[PDB]
Amino acid sequence: AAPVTVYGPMISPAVARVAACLLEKDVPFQVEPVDMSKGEHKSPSFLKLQPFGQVPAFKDSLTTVFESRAICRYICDQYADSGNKTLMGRKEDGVVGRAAIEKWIEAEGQSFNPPSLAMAFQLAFAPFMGRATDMAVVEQNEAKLVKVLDVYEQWLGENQYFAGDEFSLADLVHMPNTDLLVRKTNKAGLFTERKNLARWWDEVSARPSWKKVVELQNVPR
Template sequence: MVIKIHGHAIAPLVRLVAEVCREKEVPYELVNVEVYKGEHKTPAFREFQPFGQVPYIDDNGFILYESKAICKYIAKKYASQGTPNLVPNDPKEEALFEQAASIEASNFYPFALGIATEKIIKKHRGLEPNEVRVSELLNNLSAKLDVYDVILGKQAYLAGGSITLADLFHLPYGTIVFEELGYDMLENRPNVARWWKEITSRPSWLAVKAKA
């Protein structure tokens, strides 16, 4: 069966779910949701995603929302195909994966999302960005990336020697901050730059980078 991804093709977290489907060689169908028209806030959409956010998936009647939960589900359900060990099974390796996923959730995502909100989402809403807030977010993210550079100087990926979902979780908003908005935060962090080049050059990400 084909997994149905309900969301807008260019939404960052929709593209993340599509990327993981491609990593695991899982066919998917994008069911378009016109977020700029507010379709994700309608009662019909909220029946399946009560917070009114994209994406959610329908896997042959199994409904799941929250993008990172969706990615973990796909990686574990289809563990035997595609890129191996995106969520490791060994208890110690899984613990290191969860540690790395927590690093992204606490030390990267809030700052990258905040920058994207100020510089892009506000623009779509006809609002001006708070440049003081942007500067604060950039300074915080810069300090976190200094620590990333130390970690990635000791190992290839955030959870160890193999790529996991924890690395892939950085793709959508990292691309916005480093590439679309052009904030150069990699030049003086060679280990982060090496890691970023590697994960962004994966065919699965290149296929969905512009749209799912």
């Protein structure tokens, strides 16, 4: 079928999250650049796709969706039979299996994302935007992040992936921010020096979907 469209810069964790999901589900797509320096993401035309004036925006042959995690859920259910058929769980496990995945998707959006994103902005983006890194913000959020990682470290010592024996959207949603911290800051050790998290990252970051996302991010931002 014709390629669906994701709007925004690949360096954005939210945009990368959607791209990764489309790749896992083998859904042909094209990335439409949005000139944020010219405020294109705030234009009346863009607001019809994304009411909050933020990226990414998503559109396929049937509808438009906003919010990276809602977009991902849509892709997984609309194109369930494509690519990785178990991204949102094994059919055999039904709703109970989906819940085992959803709780960690929520952990990502509610506990992991806030502090990791704050850190990433201060350390990986600010330095290139003519802004000074706020060390107080970094320190405060690192403490919050470590608390979440302690929970994950314990969990991943009893589970290969967040949902157990198989990779799922639960693992995928955590990848964009983890990649940012591991590859673009000196905080990589928070992940790579913790036995279970290190194993998990080494495994998931090697998947072809993520390898392609990294390749797509090798564009000027």
